[PDB]
């Protein structure tokens, strides 16, 4: 607390200090050849090469430095929390693009750097190699994202390929044995669960399996206001429409407050003739994006309802009690048995969501909105699998669980969005291409030249695409010959890289080195934003009021 | 705590230091091109360009320095809290005018600077372009005050323009979805609320809806002194005048203390024949400027009463029980159903307040006295709308709620008081107008020249009106040609600026760049005083006694 | 707390600093000639030469230095916890191999050094001399591991050799006398113990001896979820199948939570007719690697059961109550009386585990997978013995107990995995052999030369195998002649060392100086990993988040 207000040269000096320091730490771990980072936590030592673990746990002494560090880190951290294996690439570009912005000052040049890089992103978005579960490149992506795990990459891509038709939902648990072990189900993970522990079998939050139910989906949150309409709706359903009904009745909703749960507890005891072996016949279920409830409505053949008063106005046309098989739970509910008739309804709805995605724009296909609709698809069409991951020690078990989870994340987002050739090649093909497109285009060559090429940003941006390919293979066999390396036309057609596991040289395509499309795009997208913010900030305020 | 008394050279040296530091930090965030500010708060980083959020959160290490900072910050902070988008302009002029005051010392010159700038405020006040909700310039103000929000400016201007007759009262909630959602009501927000939670339906502070009531507005604050007269008045109303009475009875007042609420609770229990389904038939209501209660009286057809003893001396002439529809609440009460007979009374009372604003002086029209009276008009004639603002994250939703809030505040005060051409032009036109008006006027040129032109103040002030235009457009396409820029007669007739979003050059009128009149006027008003205060201070005291 | 982020030159310097200080301290204790280390602990002084004790309790002032010290110390400490006598070796090589990694930089050389040393490991693994309990080398191993204890080594070797057939399980107690005293039993230590103290005789955790029982092994952890099925299973067993039953019933499992134990307390009280002299007839037993319960199932003739619901569906074909003799206990249970009919079942299961080890790989034979399976064999076939260790003080008794425990750990892992000739010789033979093997082989001598010999790695790695032999005998009778020492053919065929206890010179085989194979292997394996880690670290982080 010497100076709480830092403006101008000093500010940009500290920004540049923190960036370059964070850059040298995190990039050192990149690739399988990356060098290590030892981290302190109290009385132990987590020694690692995982870039996400380095990025997250770097800390600074000065509040002003740490203020900048959080701006560089929380974008890269946030990539893996949604993607899987692509954090270090984000920080690299943040550094490279920041260095660019400062090379070309004046806030027309800045707007030209934004526009050019956004057009490079579009080339990557179009480059996306779409892939099916049959494909052996899935193994290659998983082999890439696992730091060469012969055993692991083989399991997951087999597990996806062996379910050629339905997209698997995988969960992980700490295993007891040395060997791993799999637990396949024909079950669908559903996002609903108990409102109160009383509504389970045994009356204490147990896992209630059922062989028949009659579901209803409400949109509104239920609190002290709704207590009248529940008694109206429930006694209407059991008194009038008891003929076409399979117990128990599920009331699926957004939220159930403690006032509403106590009322529905009394409604179960009101009709004790329907209580078979202790099981309550009425269960309220909660879910923590209103379309995720429409899925739940569609899965269980339940009607969609907007108000709690709508339960009175119902008929056999809208009420349909399923004779399937459900497992209600405290964390989540699981549907197992689905008749061919019910799966027919769910696939037709699943095509409808895929038909919205088919016609989305190119950049819209990599949006949050798009990834949220693909989440809904996996909920509907997707079997449940539970892998108990093993190892020699407990610490290898827990370490291996993380490397399983990174792979699962990558394979899913690979076939979802796309795949690209790795080794920092796809980035170089993209930049060098986007320059050649607008320049070769005689229509806009006039102005395209005057902004980018004429100014010299094009050639700067071309040198920066190299960074990754330099970081990986500078000081290896590939770079020993011919001083540095000639990025000529002959390379651009058939791009040579080195596999750092085996040692051999060839194309990324031939050697089997692939990145996920969503990573290297979202790295660049976030890399630009965070490079801009750093480059365009001129003031730091340390005063907690 | 070295020195607790600072006089003279040392005192002004700190003021100049603090004013220059706060200037550089805040004015860097001006315009859409504006550079950013990172702010610490514990373990997070709010990075922003909003000059308010910067201004408010600047802190200084030395107590002496922070003493002066509070004086420079609180006026600019206090502009947004009543206007919406007009804070950075305040600090700019506070700097600019401080420099003017010190350039011309001696307390005859000081008096002259005030008078000249005060006449410049009048020329701004007369430049105010009055605008209807119909007008497409409302979009242009909203667009400007939103930093180019195509979606937001369109929505709020559509919402005002679709209600061409009744001025909307908007509120904002944290929305769940990606999309926004709109909740239009035919309701008027009223400032009364429950004294005690016992008086609602269910006896715990709930939202009691009613379809009939008989209100009585009291002026005085109620405490232990008034417990006798309530029992006199209440039993007089129920025993004698029960025939012309619709329950419940509303006792609206300034403040109900805990002694009086315990008495009225017993008065409800005293007559249990009138308690219809729990609802207490007597409710005391509180409000946190006595004419706001006169509005509440006119809305509910209740008689205005000075003393609590007046409740006995009443008749069927003074008492009038409404059969409308009211919703009593803990934060505020709302009236929805109003019979065309009632809105005939309310509109006539609304015109009567507009009668006072028509004939007010020009400088009186921008006062607090004026704006408070306009607050009354919106309480009387105004529908209620509640927008649940959405987005991708929680932080974007809360970020976007403020940008909604700032646009609403602007649009309201735009049509309320006026609209001016932005881009720091209007200020130049104002100063170059005021100097020429007094100079060209044959009657007062003899003395006008001797004060302002001969002493050199006019030329100083002419240069300072440029400050805003220079900060925005220096280092751009507009200032590149011909060194600096020529503010000649050719410019004053048709003033050129640069739209910083698009990059094209033109008039503020032609490009659609508009500041609110109340902002740029209250920026100057506040600029002068605060500049005066800083320039006319020669002693700082730090001692907590 | 000056800097929390150490990168590059600074990082490697501290690693080298710490390694070379930890090397100097621990290696000085090596062999019987080793020099001493005094260690503080509050208000006393443990003065020692046992390398494990040195390494573990070395600390550093700077957090950065202690960060690295944990990485050097935790591997060698973790050798003796499983192996017995082999920590200083591990550190010695960690130093040596680190040195090598730095001499040959560039990460193709790093992969070469690994592959070469990995083949040196294989040659040691093949050099492993397998040994029977009858053999007099077991004494020679013990003699080495005890720093020459004539009285101790003789006992433990005599103890294993007198039980020529069954592998003795040894435990230790602090004795009262000067002399040692032994307590032989025909008892088998079993890993089950009381869930709750209520289930023992006297109802407070006592040692309940039984002469008849009927055991049942459950796989799952038992908590509040399983309380229904236990009452279903227990009353099914006692009501239906009471004829073929010997009390008490033992419910062996993974874990019994306090909800399940309170249920079984009521089930004993439910049938008081079967309570003979206080003893509860139903005991739940817990165990803190799923195949160890299959051993417990086989030892007691109990059926293996996955679910708790399986107890209902049972028959005389699956149920068999033993009429042996068991001793239940708080820490562990003990089986004494086993009929020849039972031991036939247990020996056949033991051979079945051994037939898995017959068919393992050479490198897999030294795995934790292998060592866990061999732990199962000793539990099955293995008589119990308890030695109360004596001495002249309390401190010598406790000192001597550790040296017993090292010899037991060594002798067990010697005959388990193998024996090698000590005096640092087998390391020199292995390295000098592995070089000559690949070189001599005309098939691969083309490339083997190009990688290892031509580069100079071979000659460096050969020099480093000397390290151990140099540190023992440099500055002795063996090294005084001929300046340094010639490691020619003549030596390799008959490798001369010195017995530092006597003084005389001869072969390690002849003098009787033998290392445990598992030690000098797992030292090298660990030395390579930890050298690599140290040599490939270029970032230290001290930030406590
Ligand atoms: N065998 C290989 N040969 C060459 N390059 C490889 C190989 N495996 C991975 N890469 C490259 O290394 C880069 C990925 O590095 P790495 O996985 O260490 O960091 P990241 O994916 O950016 O972030 P994270 O720490 O989340 O994994 C990719 O550009 C990829 O092409
Ligand atoms: N597209 C544009 N082109 C040119 N000038 C613009 C544009 N948009 C806004 N401005 C100018 O920016 C100034 C307003 O600055 P800004 O909105 O950053 O701060 P403020 O309104 O003083 O306070 P606050 O921080 O509360 O918004 C006005 O003078 C206006 O003319
Ligand atoms: N009488 C002896 N003559 C020659 N060498 C010996 C003799 N006794 C032991 N050694 C050698 O000394 C080495 C063992 O030393 P030491 O027991 O101090 O190391 P360590 O086993 O790694 O440490 P710790 O026993 O604390 O785990 C072996 O190489 C062994 O061959
Ligand atoms: Mg990874
Ligand atoms: Mg604003
Ligand atoms: Mg020892």
GROMACS .gro file of N, CA, C and O in nm, chain C residues 231-296:
model
  264
 1321UNK      N    1  -3.182  -5.762   0.845
 1321UNK     CA    2  -3.293  -5.822   0.920
 1321UNK      C    3  -3.364  -5.930   0.836
 1321UNK      O    4  -3.413  -6.029   0.890
 1322UNK      N    5  -3.367  -5.911   0.704
 1322UNK     CA    6  -3.418  -6.012   0.611
 1322UNK      C    7  -3.328  -6.136   0.607
 1322UNK      O    8  -3.377  -6.248   0.608
 1323UNK      N    9  -3.197  -6.113   0.603
 1323UNK     CA   10  -3.098  -6.221   0.595
 1323UNK      C   11  -3.073  -6.297   0.725
 1323UNK      O   12  -3.060  -6.420   0.723
 1324UNK      N   13  -3.064  -6.224   0.836
 1324UNK     CA   14  -3.031  -6.283   0.967
 1324UNK      C   15  -3.144  -6.375   1.017
 1324UNK      O   16  -3.118  -6.489   1.056
 1325UNK      N   17  -3.267  -6.324   1.016
 1325UNK     CA   18  -3.385  -6.404   1.055
 1325UNK      C   19  -3.415  -6.519   0.958
 1325UNK      O   20  -3.477  -6.617   0.997
 1326UNK      N   21  -3.371  -6.507   0.832
 1326UNK     CA   22  -3.378  -6.618   0.736
 1326UNK      C   23  -3.281  -6.731   0.774
 1326UNK      O   24  -3.316  -6.848   0.762
 1327UNK      N   25  -3.161  -6.694   0.818
 1327UNK     CA   26  -3.059  -6.792   0.855
 1327UNK      C   27  -3.093  -6.867   0.985
 1327UNK      O   28  -3.077  -6.989   0.992
 1328UNK      N   29  -3.142  -6.794   1.085
 1328UNK     CA   30  -3.172  -6.852   1.217
 1328UNK      C   31  -3.304  -6.930   1.219
 1328UNK      O   32  -3.314  -7.030   1.290
 1329UNK      N   33  -3.404  -6.885   1.143
 1329UNK     CA   34  -3.535  -6.953   1.139
 1329UNK      C   35  -3.532  -7.081   1.055
 1329UNK      O   36  -3.574  -7.187   1.103
 1330UNK      N   37  -3.481  -7.072   0.932
 1330UNK     CA   38  -3.484  -7.184   0.837
 1330UNK      C   39  -3.367  -7.282   0.857
 1330UNK      O   40  -3.388  -7.401   0.878
 1331UNK      N   41  -3.244  -7.229   0.852
 1331UNK     CA   42  -3.122  -7.311   0.852
 1331UNK      C   43  -3.053  -7.312   0.988
 1331UNK      O   44  -2.934  -7.282   0.999
 1332UNK      N   45  -3.128  -7.348   1.093
 1332UNK     CA   46  -3.074  -7.358   1.229
 1332UNK      C   47  -3.009  -7.493   1.260
 1332UNK      O   48  -2.927  -7.503   1.352
 1333UNK      N   49  -3.044  -7.596   1.183
 1333UNK     CA   50  -2.995  -7.733   1.207
 1333UNK      C   51  -2.846  -7.747   1.177
 1333UNK      O   52  -2.770  -7.800   1.259
 1334UNK      N   53  -2.804  -7.700   1.059
 1334UNK     CA   54  -2.663  -7.700   1.017
 1334UNK      C   55  -2.600  -7.564   1.047
 1334UNK      O   56  -2.578  -7.483   0.956
 1335UNK      N   57  -2.570  -7.540   1.175
 1335UNK     CA   58  -2.516  -7.412   1.220
 1335UNK      C   59  -2.435  -7.428   1.349
 1335UNK      O   60  -2.476  -7.501   1.440
 1336UNK      N   61  -2.320  -7.361   1.355
 1336UNK     CA   62  -2.237  -7.353   1.475
 1336UNK      C   63  -2.216  -7.206   1.511
 1336UNK      O   64  -2.164  -7.129   1.430
 1337UNK      N   65  -2.257  -7.167   1.632
 1337UNK     CA   66  -2.253  -7.027   1.675
 1337UNK      C   67  -2.112  -6.991   1.725
 1337UNK      O   68  -2.043  -7.078   1.779
 1338UNK      N   69  -2.069  -6.865   1.711
 1338UNK     CA   70  -2.149  -6.754   1.661
 1338UNK      C   71  -2.139  -6.734   1.509
 1338UNK      O   72  -2.045  -6.784   1.446
 1339UNK      N   73  -2.235  -6.662   1.453
 1339UNK     CA   74  -2.234  -6.623   1.312
 1339UNK      C   75  -2.146  -6.498   1.297
 1339UNK      O   76  -2.166  -6.399   1.367
 1340UNK      N   77  -2.050  -6.504   1.204
 1340UNK     CA   78  -1.959  -6.393   1.178
 1340UNK      C   79  -1.994  -6.327   1.044
 1340UNK      O   80  -1.985  -6.391   0.939
 1341UNK      N   81  -2.035  -6.200   1.049
 1341UNK     CA   82  -2.064  -6.121   0.929
 1341UNK      C   83  -1.943  -6.034   0.893
 1341UNK      O   84  -1.934  -5.918   0.933
 1342UNK      N   85  -1.852  -6.092   0.815
 1342UNK     CA   86  -1.731  -6.024   0.773
 1342UNK      C   87  -1.766  -5.933   0.655
 1342UNK      O   88  -1.844  -5.972   0.568
 1343UNK      N   89  -1.709  -5.813   0.654
 1343UNK     CA   90  -1.738  -5.713   0.550
 1343UNK      C   91  -1.625  -5.611   0.535
 1343UNK      O   92  -1.521  -5.622   0.600
 1344UNK      N   93  -1.646  -5.514   0.446
 1344UNK     CA   94  -1.552  -5.404   0.425
 1344UNK      C   95  -1.560  -5.305   0.543
 1344UNK      O   96  -1.460  -5.282   0.611
 1345UNK      N   97  -1.679  -5.250   0.565
 1345UNK     CA   98  -1.703  -5.152   0.672
 1345UNK      C   99  -1.845  -5.163   0.728
 1345UNK      O  100  -1.940  -5.191   0.654
 1346UNK      N  101  -1.858  -5.141   0.859
 1346UNK     CA  102  -1.987  -5.133   0.927
 1346UNK      C  103  -2.001  -4.994   0.989
 1346UNK      O  104  -1.932  -4.962   1.086
 1347UNK      N  105  -2.090  -4.912   0.933
 1347UNK     CA  106  -2.122  -4.781   0.991
 1347UNK      C  107  -2.210  -4.797   1.115
 1347UNK      O  108  -2.268  -4.904   1.137
 1348UNK      N  109  -2.219  -4.691   1.195
 1348UNK     CA  110  -2.290  -4.696   1.324
 1348UNK      C  111  -2.441  -4.721   1.315
 1348UNK      O  112  -2.503  -4.761   1.414
 1349UNK      N  113  -2.501  -4.696   1.198
 1349UNK     CA  114  -2.641  -4.732   1.173
 1349UNK      C  115  -2.660  -4.884   1.163
 1349UNK      O  116  -2.760  -4.937   1.214
 1350UNK      N  117  -2.566  -4.953   1.099
 1350UNK     CA  118  -2.573  -5.098   1.080
 1350UNK      C  119  -2.540  -5.177   1.207
 1350UNK      O  120  -2.603  -5.280   1.234
 1351UNK      N  121  -2.440  -5.131   1.283
 1351UNK     CA  122  -2.400  -5.196   1.408
 1351UNK      C  123  -2.509  -5.193   1.516
 1351UNK      O  124  -2.525  -5.291   1.589
 1352UNK      N  125  -2.582  -5.082   1.526
 1352UNK     CA  126  -2.694  -5.070   1.619
 1352UNK      C  127  -2.813  -5.162   1.583
 1352UNK      O  128  -2.889  -5.202   1.671
 1353UNK      N  129  -2.828  -5.193   1.454
 1353UNK     CA  130  -2.930  -5.288   1.407
 1353UNK      C  131  -2.897  -5.433   1.446
 1353UNK      O  132  -2.986  -5.508   1.486
 1354UNK      N  133  -2.770  -5.471   1.433
 1354UNK     CA  134  -2.723  -5.606   1.469
 1354UNK      C  135  -2.718  -5.630   1.621
 1354UNK      O  136  -2.727  -5.745   1.665
 1355UNK      N  137  -2.702  -5.523   1.699
 1355UNK     CA  138  -2.714  -5.530   1.846
 1355UNK      C  139  -2.856  -5.572   1.889
 1355UNK      O  140  -2.871  -5.650   1.983
 1356UNK      N  141  -2.957  -5.520   1.819
 1356UNK     CA  142  -3.098  -5.558   1.843
 1356UNK      C  143  -3.131  -5.700   1.797
 1356UNK      O  144  -3.219  -5.765   1.855
 1357UNK      N  145  -3.064  -5.747   1.691
 1357UNK     CA  146  -3.084  -5.884   1.639
 1357UNK      C  147  -3.030  -5.993   1.732
 1357UNK      O  148  -3.085  -6.103   1.734
 1358UNK      N  149  -2.922  -5.964   1.805
 1358UNK     CA  150  -2.873  -6.054   1.912
 1358UNK      C  151  -2.973  -6.062   2.029
 1358UNK      O  152  -2.997  -6.171   2.082
 1359UNK      N  153  -3.028  -5.947   2.068
 1359UNK     CA  154  -3.131  -5.939   2.173
 1359UNK      C  155  -3.265  -6.001   2.132
 1359UNK      O  156  -3.342  -6.044   2.219
 1360UNK      N  157  -3.293  -6.003   2.002
 1360UNK     CA  158  -3.415  -6.065   1.948
 1360UNK      C  159  -3.424  -6.215   1.974
 1360UNK      O  160  -3.533  -6.268   1.996
 1361UNK      N  161  -3.309  -6.284   1.971
 1361UNK     CA  162  -3.301  -6.428   1.999
 1361UNK      C  163  -3.208  -6.454   2.120
 1361UNK      O  164  -3.091  -6.487   2.102
 1362UNK      N  165  -3.261  -6.438   2.243
 1362UNK     CA  166  -3.181  -6.461   2.364
 1362UNK      C  167  -3.156  -6.609   2.398
 1362UNK      O  168  -3.069  -6.638   2.479
 1363UNK      N  169  -3.232  -6.700   2.336
 1363UNK     CA  170  -3.215  -6.845   2.357
 1363UNK      C  171  -3.077  -6.898   2.315
 1363UNK      O  172  -3.029  -6.996   2.371
 1364UNK      N  173  -3.016  -6.832   2.217
 1364UNK     CA  174  -2.885  -6.871   2.164
 1364UNK      C  175  -2.765  -6.803   2.235
 1364UNK      O  176  -2.650  -6.834   2.201
 1365UNK      N  177  -2.790  -6.714   2.331
 1365UNK     CA  178  -2.684  -6.642   2.402
 1365UNK      C  179  -2.625  -6.732   2.513
 1365UNK      O  180  -2.684  -6.745   2.620
 1366UNK      N  181  -2.509  -6.791   2.485
 1366UNK     CA  182  -2.440  -6.881   2.578
 1366UNK      C  183  -2.334  -6.805   2.658
 1366UNK      O  184  -2.230  -6.768   2.602
 1367UNK      N  185  -2.362  -6.782   2.786
 1367UNK     CA  186  -2.267  -6.720   2.881
 1367UNK      C  187  -2.228  -6.576   2.846
 1367UNK      O  188  -2.113  -6.536   2.865
 1368UNK      N  189  -2.324  -6.499   2.794
 1368UNK     CA  190  -2.302  -6.358   2.758
 1368UNK      C  191  -2.265  -6.334   2.612
 1368UNK      O  192  -2.314  -6.238   2.553
 1369UNK      N  193  -2.180  -6.420   2.556
 1369UNK     CA  194  -2.132  -6.409   2.416
 1369UNK      C  195  -2.244  -6.382   2.315
 1369UNK      O  196  -2.335  -6.463   2.302
 1370UNK      N  197  -2.237  -6.267   2.244
 1370UNK     CA  198  -2.331  -6.245   2.133
 1370UNK      C  199  -2.307  -6.344   2.019
 1370UNK      O  200  -2.192  -6.370   1.983
 1371UNK      N  201  -2.416  -6.398   1.964
 1371UNK     CA  202  -2.409  -6.496   1.855
 1371UNK      C  203  -2.389  -6.435   1.714
 1371UNK      O  204  -2.360  -6.509   1.620
 1372UNK      N  205  -2.404  -6.303   1.701
 1372UNK     CA  206  -2.386  -6.232   1.574
 1372UNK      C  207  -2.278  -6.122   1.588
 1372UNK      O  208  -2.297  -6.028   1.667
 1373UNK      N  209  -2.169  -6.134   1.513
 1373UNK     CA  210  -2.059  -6.035   1.514
 1373UNK      C  211  -2.037  -5.978   1.373
 1373UNK      O  212  -2.017  -6.054   1.279
 1374UNK      N  213  -2.042  -5.843   1.359
 1374UNK     CA  214  -1.997  -5.778   1.236
 1374UNK      C  215  -1.848  -5.743   1.244
 1374UNK      O  216  -1.805  -5.683   1.344
 1375UNK      N  217  -1.772  -5.779   1.141
 1375UNK     CA  218  -1.626  -5.760   1.138
 1375UNK      C  219  -1.583  -5.678   1.016
 1375UNK      O  220  -1.635  -5.698   0.906
 1376UNK      N  221  -1.488  -5.587   1.037
 1376UNK     CA  222  -1.445  -5.489   0.935
 1376UNK      C  223  -1.299  -5.508   0.894
 1376UNK      O  224  -1.223  -5.578   0.962
 1377UNK      N  225  -1.260  -5.444   0.783
 1377UNK     CA  226  -1.124  -5.453   0.727
 1377UNK      C  227  -1.088  -5.323   0.652
 1377UNK      O  228  -1.166  -5.279   0.567
 1378UNK      N  229  -0.971  -5.261   0.681
 1378UNK     CA  230  -0.941  -5.130   0.623
 1378UNK      C  231  -0.882  -5.142   0.482
 1378UNK      O  232  -0.956  -5.140   0.384
 1379UNK      N  233  -0.793  -5.375  -0.394
 1379UNK     CA  234  -0.752  -5.488  -0.311
 1379UNK      C  235  -0.869  -5.563  -0.252
 1379UNK      O  236  -0.877  -5.581  -0.131
 1380UNK      N  237  -0.959  -5.608  -0.339
 1380UNK     CA  238  -1.077  -5.686  -0.299
 1380UNK      C  239  -1.047  -5.835  -0.273
 1380UNK      O  240  -1.125  -5.902  -0.206
 1381UNK      N  241  -0.935  -5.884  -0.324
 1381UNK     CA  242  -0.900  -6.027  -0.313
 1381UNK      C  243  -0.855  -6.073  -0.172
 1381UNK      O  244  -0.848  -6.193  -0.147
 1382UNK      N  245  -0.826  -5.979  -0.081
 1382UNK     CA  246  -0.794  -6.013   0.059
 1382UNK      C  247  -0.914  -6.067   0.138
 1382UNK      O  248  -0.895  -6.140   0.235
 1383UNK      N  249  -1.035  -6.029   0.098
 1383UNK     CA  250  -1.159  -6.086   0.154
 1383UNK      C  251  -1.185  -6.227   0.101
 1383UNK      O  252  -1.243  -6.310   0.172
 1384UNK      N  253  -1.145  -6.253  -0.024
 1384UNK     CA  254  -1.150  -6.388  -0.081
 1384UNK      C  255  -1.055  -6.486  -0.010
 1384UNK      O  256  -1.083  -6.606  -0.006
 1385UNK      N  257  -0.945  -6.435   0.045
 1385UNK     CA  258  -0.856  -6.514   0.131
 1385UNK      C  259  -0.926  -6.548   0.263
 1385UNK      O  260  -0.928  -6.663   0.305
 1386UNK      N  261  -0.983  -6.445   0.326
 1386UNK     CA  262  -1.059  -6.458   0.451
 1386UNK      C  263  -1.179  -6.552   0.433
 1386UNK      O  264  -1.212  -6.628   0.524
   0.00000   0.00000   0.00000
